[PDB]
């Protein structure tokens, strides 16, 4: 059936502990406000040195380090290579984004919220996407002191994880609640401890 | 740094002289949508949803990698054979869920700041090498053009468990053992 594409790379000018020589090519697409602001940046990288790039905002290949003038000047002289790279803003970025609307951007994994111990740890695990709001409430009062939160933890399996800690001195009748808001949740999850 | 609501890498293309070896993958919002098995010429999507509704021709990946092989040789010569610099990777071990005895869980070993992308990530159970129930992500790209890779250890939490993530990399003097604190 029909297949999506990636960035087609340009060919370099040449004709034709253990040491290692590494090459990377990154066809990168940036999206903002849906399909209202799209930007293509293809990156040519030797080891860790990005030496030549195409920026759709610029429209031509540009050299980044003294290693890229021969590549950038040659790719810009090839009319079809330059035109096809510009058109990848449509054939790659804008096209594949429409397939993300059908799949990735509709993926909703509800988070699992648990509390355990003084210090109270609210574990918010296995959620997607990466937009989340975790707040501690003591007797219907949002805690705003002594709340240390770990950074957003990427599990690498299309789920995220975050742990919010609350240093609390428990008292008679004190009910502590972890509030979690997430796009997959019509109402925020509230978990009490007391 | 480009600010955007979503970032996709429709083409993380990798090729290196050691091996030699390569990698082709697409990423969206920092996660791997698929990689292409260059030896078996197969696209391997990472979610069931992708396997049912998304399609990518492996020949496009094989062709791009062949260009990378040619571009690498050219820039090796242009740079006076300037070799890659070995970075020191940083290793972090944590669990996917809060750990409860008898409830099957997963240990996650994040190996960050990898370069060159040649690494050996293995697990140890009480000093014994774990060879089964282990999986791994591809090399995932970073904006500084290094990589990170995540290894998964499925385990049944028990009282007498000692798990370590052993990482071997040229940037390390010795193999790095990262013991998992039960937390």
């Amino acid at each position: 059936g029909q297949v999506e594409l990636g960035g087609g790379n340009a060919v370099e000018v040449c004709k034709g502990s253990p040491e290692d020589f590494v090459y990377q090519f990154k066809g990168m697409c940036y999206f903002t406000n849906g399909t209202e602001r799209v930007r293509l940046v293809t990156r040519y990288i030797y080891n860790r040195e990005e030496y030549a790039r195409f920026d759709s905002d610029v429209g031509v290949y540009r050299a980044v380090t003294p290693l890229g003038p021969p590549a950038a000047e040659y790719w810009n002289s090839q009319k079809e290579v330059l035109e096809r790279t510009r058109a990848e803003l449509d054939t790659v970025c804008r096209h594949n984004y429409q397939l993300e609307l059908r799949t990735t951007l509709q993926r909703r994994v509800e988070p699992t919220v648990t509390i355990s111990p003084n210090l109270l740890v609210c574990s918010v695990t296995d959620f997607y996407p990466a937009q989340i709001k975790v707040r501690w409430f003591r007797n219907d009062q949002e805690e705003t002191t002594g709340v240390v939160s770990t950074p957003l933890i990427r599990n690498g399996d299309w789920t995220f994880q975050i742990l919010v800690m609350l240093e609390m001195t428990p008292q008679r009748g004190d009910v502590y609640t972890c509030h979690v808001e997430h796009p997959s949740l019509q109402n925020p999850i509230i978990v009490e401890w007391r | 740094d480009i600010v955007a609501d979503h970032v996709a890498s429709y083409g993380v293309n990798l090729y290196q002289s050691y091996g030699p070896s390569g990698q082709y993958s697409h990423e969206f919002d920092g996660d791997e949508e698929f990689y292409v098995d260059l030896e078996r010429k197969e696209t391997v999507w990472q979610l069931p949803l992708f396997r049912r509704f998304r399609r990518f021709d492996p020949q496009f990946a094989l062709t791009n990698i062949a260009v990378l092989k040619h571009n690498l040789n050219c820039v090796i010569k242009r740079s006076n054979s300037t070799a890659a610099t070995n970075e020191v990777p940083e290793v972090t071990v944590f669990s996917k869920s809060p750990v409860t005895l008898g409830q099957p869980n997963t240990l996650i070993c994040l190996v960050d700041n990898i370069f060159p992308p040649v690494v050996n990530i293995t697990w140890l159970s009480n000093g014994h090498s774990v060879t089964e129930g282990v999986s791994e992500t591809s090399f995932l790209s970073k904006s500084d053009h290094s990589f990170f890779k995540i290894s998964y250890l499925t385990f049944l939490p028990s009282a007498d468990e000692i798990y370590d993530c052993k990482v071997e990399h040229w940037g390390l003097d010795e193999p790095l053992l990262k013991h998992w604190e039960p937390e």
């Epitope: 029909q2 999506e4 004709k15 449509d90 790659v92 804008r94 | 021709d57 062709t63």
Partner: T-cell receptor, first 112, second 111 residues
Framework: MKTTQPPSMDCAEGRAANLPCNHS???????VYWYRQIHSQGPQYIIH???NNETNEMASLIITEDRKSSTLILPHATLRDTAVYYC??????????????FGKGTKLSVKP | GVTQTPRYLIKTRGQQVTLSCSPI?????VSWYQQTPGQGLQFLFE???????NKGNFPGRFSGRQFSNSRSEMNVSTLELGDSALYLC???????????FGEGSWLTVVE
């Protein structure tokens, strides 16, 4: 194949030829290519386009807004333009990604 | 442009034929086609970096090869009368760029 064309078409010499092509199942990552073949010669590339209109020394290419059809405009048709004109969608399909599959085309006869 | 030899060939049934193609200078992708009055212009196979990529629907008798200089050869084994055709070679700068055809090799298989 994704393109259909009228089998034959006549054009008066010195007029412009407007050869139509339909391709409703075209994808957003597929280009439209036009070739021709005079007699027993190798096929000749004419022009290609994605969405915009294109013009080179040989012809213009008009792709409709919905991209479901296109038209090749040959200016000042001469006897040397008598050929079979092939409208080809360079498909993005598994196992044939980037292929140029030739159809029956349009036999253009430039009448003096 | 694309150079193709031999221009005209005469073979008998059961023989083999090798067709040579020199792409446009700098071009690295090469594609082969067979043109008959019956089947029309039919795609054989495509080469880049010395390896076959996309392939048409022809039997194993039709094989090809590409050298490190991007020149390509094509071979037909156990020739049949229906193999008489125009055999066209086309090249493009990269795989996926505009392909430009040569003039072809005219093969006649005779009894």
């Amino acid at each position: 194949m994704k393109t259909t064309q009228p089998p034959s078409m006549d054009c008066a010499e010195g007029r412009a030829a407007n050869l139509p092509c339909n391709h409703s199942t075209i994808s957003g990552n597929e280009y439209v290519y036009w070739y021709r073949q005079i007699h027993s010669q190798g096929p000749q590339y004419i022009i290609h386009g994605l969405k915009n209109n294109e013009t080179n020394e040989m012809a213009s290419l008009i792709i409709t807004e919905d991209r479901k059809s296109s038209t090749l405009i040959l200016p000042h048709a001469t006897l040397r333009d008598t050929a079979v004109y092939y409208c080809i969608v360079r498909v993005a399909i598994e196992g044939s990604q980037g292929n140029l599959i030739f159809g029956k085309g349009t036999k253009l006869s430039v009448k003096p | 442009g694309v150079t193709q030899t031999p221009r005209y060939l005469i073979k008998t049934r059961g023989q083999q034929v090798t067709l040579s193609c020199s792409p446009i200078s700098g071009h690295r992708s090469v594609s082969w086609y067979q043109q008959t009055p019956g089947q029309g212009l039919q795609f054989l196979f495509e080469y880049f970096s010395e390896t076959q990529r996309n392939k048409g629907n022809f039997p194993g008798r039709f094989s090809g090869r590409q050298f490190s200089n991007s020149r390509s050869e094509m071979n037909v084994s156990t020739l049949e009368l229906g193999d008489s055709a125009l055999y066209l070679c086309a090249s493009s700068l990269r795989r996926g760029d505009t392909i430009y055809f040569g003039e072809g090799s005219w093969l006649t298989v005779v009894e």
